[PDB]
Structure 1
């Protein structure tokens, strides 16, 4: 690692860890396309296990980028179309409010106010159908954006139906395997538990709890090496040999809607680069959206990013395609989003 990268990373993260009381953290900087790794602290405080390049962290909502790319791949394969009605892949959804709601609306949180969380009471397949049938939109489709797990979560579930594979099998075979993310999991196998960090919430060790559409919305666990590979794949999709996956990655970084200075892709969110650091910057935030008709194909001069959290973890990924630059920050404490973005910007701005 060039001393320059070493210095900006350490000078930025050391203080972050101190100020936020983060138990353990891993960071990857992709510079001129090559990855440089950094780790600090503990994966498990009680057992004194250090964070290493093999430690698994819960990605939380950064998992939505995988769902958006898997969806992009199904589109490229001709299995689904974002313009299709939700009812085409779920005929049992007969309630009238669903008329006009398309897979694009689900994927981009513009269905009309689907809730941030699926209630804990919802578990079985019949429970889920009931939940969506009973939901009453606050708004017409494609008029307001409300970030929601029950929205992109349903998109992920429907998107894999034509394939005949479960969401986990589809993700493994169409995304993880092709990209060689061999230590990325929806369900952590027993063989890999020795590497699964504990998350910390109010000092207590915790792992994410099972929930409906958890795989689709916030259930991926990964290492800093595999996430660095994920960032490189998204920085240069053309190097990817699998044709539909290469295309899927590109579809996920297309700009479908605009709210303020930000653009909504599939999972990924983007802003034009150069970005005002404070512009990159609440339990529920409903914002009107302007449709980008037709969507803008992935713009190289973009700050592409996604924040993620679970009760015990906090993650952040951001990259700038035009500069072959990127960063992944994984931590086992859910600390403020502004602090993650401030650190990422400080590091990437210094190397750009």
Structure 2
């Protein structure tokens, strides 16, 4: 073998080193899905991980939120270059008069922070927060990774179609993507599949609920459903609107170094080195404001790219990467929040091999 041995040789040492109780890994190669399952979903019960185990994917959720937002645009709810307050009456007169929906989606509204301030934890206080927010930078000039930013994008995009976000996600988007084992709120029927996360203190934990949580980091899913979503991104057919929506998430709106920001997905010119992938996923990019390289117009980024997204929650660590031109992808879902650097290194190791 190369493939079982390739994945095993990379994943198993990493689990030992970061004491990861469980991981589900899925890869795509030559049209087919391959599942590699390690350890336990639940330490107390000993339930083993499978490709049907539900994990919190954290901010990988943004790629689905982005797809939802794109879908609403395609269906005419809004245009990406519309000012945000065109689609939020309660933001008329605020800074959002001068921010576009695209800018919201791509963390470039002007310095919205990584998280809401702590007592911005209700709908009323969230509205006042945005109404009263004072931009740090001119719109479209700085990227600062931000849950309030893509949070509001997803919320307003769903509203442009007349529905709450969770309804649009659960009743329209996920069903059209053929993702029937993916959830914002895990139903009682599926709870037996729901892994526990583990904190640094080895205490079992699950996601803290909150304002715009569903939009920013709210999805629970297993490796098989998530790879199916990645497959849709490699070459989807059928629903013309959904096809167009997926295309839109592969549009790049600006770059920061070698990373081009899309809707949800971040991408790189392919081939890409480990060092470059690491840098683009590092705190240098994710934890502080960066000035962007502006694009004259948004551009379709195409097939010879590596697309990816990191996600974590208090107890979970997720990574997804895919390369459409080479027909390869990896999904790595774990129930410990272990370093992104290890995620990226292992994924690059495996993808480098799949491309053989």
Common topology (TM > 0.5): yes
CA distance in 2, matches of 1:298, 1:267: 13
Provide the secondary structure at the position in 1 that maps to 2:89: coil
Matches within 5 A, 1:184-263: 184-202=182-200, 203-237=202-236, 239=237, 241-263=238-260
Name the CA distance, whole Å, in 2 between partners of 1:332 and 1:126. 34
Stretches of 4+ aligned residues off by more than 3 angstroms = none
**Separation (CA, whole Å) in 1 of partners of 2:256 and 2:28:** 28
Aligned counterparts of 1:146 and 1:122: Cα–Cα separation in 2: 19
Instruction: Name the SS of the counterpart of 1:99 in structure 2.
Output: helix
- Is 2:132 the counterpart of 1:131? no
Counterparts of 1:213 and 1:111 in 2: how far apart (Å)?
17
**Paired residue for 2:272?**
275
Query: 3-state SS of the aligned residue for 2:179?
Result: coil
Normalised TM-score (structure 1): 0.96
Q: What is the CA deviation profile of residues 291-339 of structure 1, one whole-angstrom value per residue up to 9, with x for unaligned ones?
A: 2222111310001000000010000000000011000000000001110
Q: Kindly provide the CA deviation profile for residues 26-48 of structure 1, in whole angstroms up to 9, marking residues without a partner as x.
A: 00000012100011111110111
SS in 1 for 2:172: helix
Q: Secondary structure at the match of 2:2?
A: helix
CA deviation map 1:234-287 (0-9, x unaligned): 1113x2x11111100010011110110000000000000000111011372211
- Shift in Å, 1:197: 0.3
Q: Separation in 1 of the partners of 2:163 and 2:19?
A: 42
Further displaced range: 151-160 or 161-170: 161-170
- Please list the CA deviations of residues 78-99 of structure 1 after superposition, one character each: whole Å capped at 9, or x if unmatched: 1111110110111111344223
Cα RMSD between the aligned structures?
1.1
Q: Distance in 2 between matches of 1:299 and 1:120?
A: 39
CA-to-aligned-CA distance 1:114-141 (integer Å, 9 cap, x gap) = 0111234233321111111222211110
Map Cα deviations across residues 190-214 of structure 1 (whole Å, 9 max, x no partner).
1111110000012010000111000
1:318 to 304, 321, 332: 321
Q: Which moved more, 1:179-188 or 1:97-106?
A: 97-106
The answer to whether the 8 Å contact 2:328/2:351 transfers is yes
Greater CA deviation, 94-103 or 3-12?
94-103
Deviations 1:180-232 (A, max 9, x none): 11110000011111110000012010000111000000000001110110111
Could you tell me which residue of structure 1 aligns to residue 9 of structure 2? 11
* Pick aligned residue for 1:53 from 51, 70, 91: 51
Distance 2:93 2:77 in 1: 24
Report the 3-state secondary structure (helix = DSSP H, G, I; strand = E; otherwise coil) of the residue aligned with 1:300: coil
Instruction: Confirm or deny: 8 A CA contact 1:250 1:298 kept in the other structure.
Output: no
Alignment counterpart, residue 89 of structure 1, candidates 67, 87, 90: 87
Aligned equivalent of 1:307, options 297, 310, 316: 310
Q: Is the 8 A contact 2:182 2:222 kept in 1?
A: yes
Between the aligned partners of 1:84 and 1:26, the Cα distance in structure 2 is 40
